[PDB]
A and B are shown apart, each in its own frame.
Chain A
Amino acid sequence: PTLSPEQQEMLQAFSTQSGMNLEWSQKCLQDNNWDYTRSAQAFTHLKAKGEIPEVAFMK
């Protein structure tokens, strides 16, 4: 339900970089072990395929 200080900073960074809202950014990071490099790769892979749900990019 809540994030550590370090996770909070990672979340804000990833939301900005990916363009996803905070909740979907948190989902991507959690799905990838709070590993930013891995999360970014995973995101980029799915984005290119057109498979990320459009709700992920809404405010």
Chain B
Amino acid sequence: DSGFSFGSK
């Protein structure tokens, strides 16, 4: 779960 992610998850 490293780096850029979209939304609140």
Contacts and interface: CB of A to CB of B under 8 A. Distances in A.
Say what secondary structure dominates the interface of chain B.
loop
B8 interface: yes
Q: Tell me the dominant secondary structure on chain A's binding face.
A: helix
Interface of A: 27-28, 31-33, 38-39, 41-43, 46, 52-53
B6 A53 contact: no
B6 to A, nearest CB: 4
Contacts of B5: 31
A53 B6 CA distance: 11
A42 B9 CA distance: 10
A18 B3 CA distance: 20
